[PDB]
Design a protein around this ligand. Structure first.
Ligand SMILES: [Br-]
Ligand SMILES: [Br-]
Ligand SMILES: [Br-]
Ligand SMILES: [Br-]
Ligand SMILES: [Br-]
Length: 229
């Protein structure tokens, strides 16, 4: 049978993203809009910095900007915590430690408002070097594929993950962003607590040639894979 959560994602779902950020005291906001198609694990989103110039590089916000759109293969459906929490939704929290630089702390609520899947985020960044790779805008505008190991967090009735993102720099090195993540449901309803599994990501960043505002276009695919060999 198709679960309550699963049925909310059988077609194309509009997405709205709102972020309020503050990094080393530099305040900024970003809105995003687009669509998710969970059947294909597909996200298409365009983000606009509504406060002027984004004071951090767009790539550093990609992981922050809706894992309910992941494609879970049929044999993996029991492990999809993210859809099981809908429509009431879940809180996603991270600390992202940039190696040799500062860290982001994020809190996002992901939930439906009517037919729209909303990702509402607050982000606070501290201890950044004003001329480091982040505040100095030294990251290439691109993105690597990454696998994320999702684990159940029984104590907290949700999931957790930690993974390292590599942001390429043009001198051939990378800026590491070490993610520690915890998701917990917003409703008191039943959720799926998964066995350990992976989510495989690819992300492509681009620009709208007709857009004068500071912005990012993101195309991202997420697919789950199991550990039964
Ligand atoms: Br600060
Ligand atoms: Br605007
Ligand atoms: Br950028
Ligand atoms: Br995602
Ligand atoms: Br988050």
């Amino acid at each position: 049978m198709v679960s309550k959560g699963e049925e909310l994602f059988t077609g194309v779902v509009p997405i709205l993203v709102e972020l309020d950020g503050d990094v080393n005291g530099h305040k900024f906001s970003v809105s995003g809009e687009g669509e998710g198609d969970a059947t294909y694990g597909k996200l298409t989103l365009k983000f606009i910095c509504t406060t002027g110039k984004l004071p951090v590089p767009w790539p550093t916000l990609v992981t922050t900007f809706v894992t309910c759109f992941a494609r879970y293969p049929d044999h993996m459906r029991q492990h999809d915590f993210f859809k099981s929490a809908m429509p009431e939704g879940y809180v996603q929290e991270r600390t992202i430690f940039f190696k040799d630089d500062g860290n982001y702390k994020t809190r996002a609520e992901v939930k439906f408002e009517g037919d729209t899947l909303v990702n509402r985020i607050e982000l606070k960044g501290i201890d950044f070097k004003e001329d480091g790779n982040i505040l100095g805008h030294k990251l290439e505008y691109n993105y690597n594929s990454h696998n994320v190991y999702i684990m159940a967090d029984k104590q907290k009735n949700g999931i957790k993950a930690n993974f390292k993102i590599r942001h390429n720099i043009e001198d051939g090195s990378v800026q590491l962003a070490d993610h520690y993540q915890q998701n917990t449901p917003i409703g008191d309803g039943p959720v799926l607590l998964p066995d350990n599994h992976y989510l495989s990501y690819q992300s492509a960043l681009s620009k709208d040639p007709n857009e004068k505002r500071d912005h990012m276009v993101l195309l991202e695919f997420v697919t789950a894979a199991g550990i039964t060999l």
